[PDB]
Design an enzyme around this catalytic site. Structure first.
Site, PDB file in Angstrom:
ATOM      1  CG  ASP A  75       9.643  62.291  -0.200  1.00 23.95           C
ATOM      2  OD1 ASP A  75       8.683  62.463   0.653  1.00 23.95           O
ATOM      3  OD2 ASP A  75      10.545  63.136  -0.203  1.00 23.95           O
ATOM      4  CE1 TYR A  93      13.907  64.554  10.152  1.00 24.04           C
ATOM      5  CE2 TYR A  93      13.287  66.238   8.941  1.00 24.04           C
ATOM      6  CZ  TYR A  93      13.295  64.926   9.576  1.00 24.04           C
ATOM      7  OH  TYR A  93      12.047  64.304   8.908  1.00 24.04           O
ATOM      8  NE  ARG A 103       9.392  68.838   5.990  1.00 23.89           N
ATOM      9  CZ  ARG A 103       8.408  69.416   6.286  1.00 23.89           C
ATOM     10  NH1 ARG A 103       8.309  70.856   6.442  1.00 23.89           N
ATOM     11  NH2 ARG A 103       7.073  68.641   6.201  1.00 23.89           N
TER      12      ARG A 103
END
Ligand SMILES: Nc1nc2c(ncn2[C@@H]2O[C@H](COP(=O)(O)OP(=O)(O)O)[C@@H](O)[C@H]2O)c(=O)[nH]1
Ligand SMILES: [Mn+2]
Ligand SMILES: [Mn+2]
Ligand code: NA
Length: 620
Positions: free
Chosen positions: A309, A233, A85
């Site tokens: 998560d 990503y 990130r």
């Protein structure tokens, strides 16, 4: 309608039909095709055929490699500029800055990044027009939650990246069934481009299309849009995950009375046959996945994984905090993963898994630091940089933020209620991060208000999950620093308000530290499955066991309350030590941070907990 022939993209559809889409979905697809100018439009169906063919195509093109040692596993190696990130390039657009972040006294906020609508329009116009020329625009209908659940939220992601399509099929529920469930309903509008229209204007590195200089991940909550440019990503390109299910969703949750959090959800069963669910917020790369699918070392204990998560939670009419995992897979940090540390992850990732930025063995398997499996003599290793590698070399064979992306249904301890639309009832919430000094293994908050302060005060060494280097200790309140969809002060108020809800059965709040180190920089606690000993103590405390002693920071285990059988070599006094000097410094630091960064939006209750902690420390 059209006076010429450039508005209706029907002729460019290579799978599906614009006519078959719900009206508003067609408008979203076609409007963005007009802007981005893809050569083709592929409406994803989510089928195994589509997936296998897309993977083989990527393999053809040299974008991914098949890992021949395993069942349907694949390895992507990225441009080293696109590996994690980038918080500084991640923004939320609102009319008023203060709706997005508190106005920091110091002038630079560490609680998000705001961009005006004017500035975003200019940035958008400098990026997206024509960005998909020569490429396919894939249309990904996805559900965050089980197909057809009343609490699922649906989105449509447009992307020019087959890697994103494949990873979204794992991390969400994706395909024709989602369009059918959506009908004429609302959906989150997600637009992604790698930012490399053909013919390529710039060199292609490692066959990985990206545009680092122009990378920008934007959220427009009132318009219900997420717009991400330049990075492949997963944290930046899987738009259902951080962008939607934390940033957009946390703001919705504020408005609607629920919570969207950076938390694992696990179920734990004790030797007396009682099961409880816990949630835990640790920053990126700080132990969630390993805790969520823990193999406990204590006999008679069992952990099951609901999610690793993201949690969506609310207090129901009975007063129970019930939680759901809106994801369909695990996007886990690879290095460190071994049979000894996370045997359940090892079983999960042996099939149908995409790996990114790990090393490859000559017999077609994967490798990374900490994998803890000897290779046969003669077997060689190719690093994530596509160079031959030996363990004696200066650099790691896998990127520190390399990942597996794997179906959650394959986890051998996936919880039987992980797809229940009723969610699971949370009885404890655990905060924690990487603190090499000062902070003991476990403590319990004194009250709800104290527990919200403990979340607010979280700090943690920087990791490889974003752009922060070194191991600088950073504030990361609620593990949400990168992810708040709105003003953090308001988020604290929202958390505090839960205490006054009808019949609320508030979970106990704990703070852990798996990462305290001795004078030589060695961990004081072994962690992984041994963390079951901490969970045992928490379980007892939830049941009302008198197993705690009061300290200035909260309750800790009484002497002899923790089961340390088999860990006679742990230095308990050192690991649990609370130093007045360390904590005087700590509370001063927290005071200055909250005053600077939260300021006028800091709830009175949280400032009160700060004053109370300072006073308890002063009496040491
Ligand atoms: N020392 C130690 N390392 C851990 C522990 N849990 C996880 N890790 C390591 O920390 C990294 C991130 O772990 P992970 O569970 O994936 O964290 P997440 O990104 O928060 O889900 C991996 O390299 C793990 O091996 C623990 O209890 N102790
Ligand atoms: Mn995360
Ligand atoms: Mn994780
Ligand atoms: Na590559």
């Amino acid at each position: 309608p059209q006076l010429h022939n450039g508005l209706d993209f029907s002729a460019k559809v290579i799978q599906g039909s614009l006519d078959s889409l719900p009206q508003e979905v067609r408008k979203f697809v076609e409007g963005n095709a007009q802007l981005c100018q893809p050569e083709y439009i592929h409406i994803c169906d989510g089928s195994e055929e589509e997936y296998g063919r897309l993977l083989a195509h990527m393999q053809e093109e040299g974008v991914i490699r098949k890992l021949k040692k395993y069942d349907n596993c694949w390895l992507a190696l990225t441009d080293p500029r696109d590996v994690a990130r980038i918080e500084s390039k991640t923004v939320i657009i609102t009319q008023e800055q203060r709706d997005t972040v508190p106005i920091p006294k110091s002038g630079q906020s560490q609680l998000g990044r705001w961009m005006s609508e004017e500035d975003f329009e200019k940035a958008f116009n400098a990026r997206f027009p024509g960005c998909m020329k020569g490429r396919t625009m894939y249309v990904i209908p996805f559900s965050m939650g089980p197909l057809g659940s009343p609490l699922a939220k649906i989105g449509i992601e447009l992307t020019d990246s087959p890697y994103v399509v494949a990873s979204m099929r794992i991390m969400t529920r994706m395909g024709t069934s989602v369009l059918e469930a959506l009908g004429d309903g609302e959906f989150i509008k997600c637009l992604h481009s790698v930012g490399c229209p053909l013919p390529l204007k710039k060199p292609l590195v490692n066959n990985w299309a990206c545009n680092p200089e122009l990378t920008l991940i934007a959220h427009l909550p009132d318009r219900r849009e997420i717009i991400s440019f330049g990075s492949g990503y997963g944290g930046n390109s899987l738009l259902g995950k951080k962008c939607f299910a934390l940033r957009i969703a946390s703001r919705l949750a504020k408005e609607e009375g629920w919570l969207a959090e950076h938390m694992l959800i696990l179920g734990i069963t004790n030797p007396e046959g009682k099961k409880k669910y816990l949630a835990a917020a640790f920053p990126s790369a700080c132990g969630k996945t390993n805790l969520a699918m823990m193999n406990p070392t204590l006999p008679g204990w069992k952990v099951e994984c609901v999610g690793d998560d993201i949690a969506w939670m609310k207090f129901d009419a009975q007063g129970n905090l019930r939680a759901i995992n809106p994801e369909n897979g695990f996007f886990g940090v690879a290095p460190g993963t071994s049979v000894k540390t996370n045997p359940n992850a090892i079983k999960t990732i042996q099939k149908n898994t995409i790996f990114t930025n790990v090393a490859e063995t000559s017999d077609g398997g994967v490798y990374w630091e900490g994998i803890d499996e000897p290779l046969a003599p003669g077997v060689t290793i190719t690093s994530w940089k596509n160079k031959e590698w030996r363990p004696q070399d200066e650099e790691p064979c896998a990127h520190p933020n390399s990942r597996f992306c794997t179906p959650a249904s394959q986890c051998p301890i996936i919880d039987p209620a992980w797809e229940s639309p009723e969610g699971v009832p949370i009885e404890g919430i655990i905060f924690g991060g990487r603190r090499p000094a000062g902070v003991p293994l476990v403590y319990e908050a004194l009250s709800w208000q104290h527990g919200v302060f403990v979340g607010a005060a979280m700090r943690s060494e920087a990791t490889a999950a974003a752009e922060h280097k070194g191991k600088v200790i950073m504030h990361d309140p609620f593990a949400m620093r990168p992810f708040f969809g709105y003003n953090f002060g308001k988020y604290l108020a929202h958390w505090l308000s839960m205490a006054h809800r009808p019949a609320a059965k508030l979970p106990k709040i704990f703070h852990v530290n798996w990462f305290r180190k001795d004078k030589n920089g060695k961990f004081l606690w072994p962690g992984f499955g041994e963390n079951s000993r901490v969970l045992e103590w928490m379980f007892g405390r939830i049941e009302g066991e008198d197993s705690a002693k009061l300290t200035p920071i909260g309750y800790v285990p009484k002497e002899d309350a923790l089961n340390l059988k088999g860990l006679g070599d742990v230095n308990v006094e050192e690991l649990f030590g609370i130093s007045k000097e360390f904590w005087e410094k700590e509370v001063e630091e927290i005071d200055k941070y909250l005053e600077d960064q939260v300021n006028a939006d800091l709830p009175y209750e949280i400032e009160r907990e700060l004053r109370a902690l300072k006073q308890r420390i002063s009496q040491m």
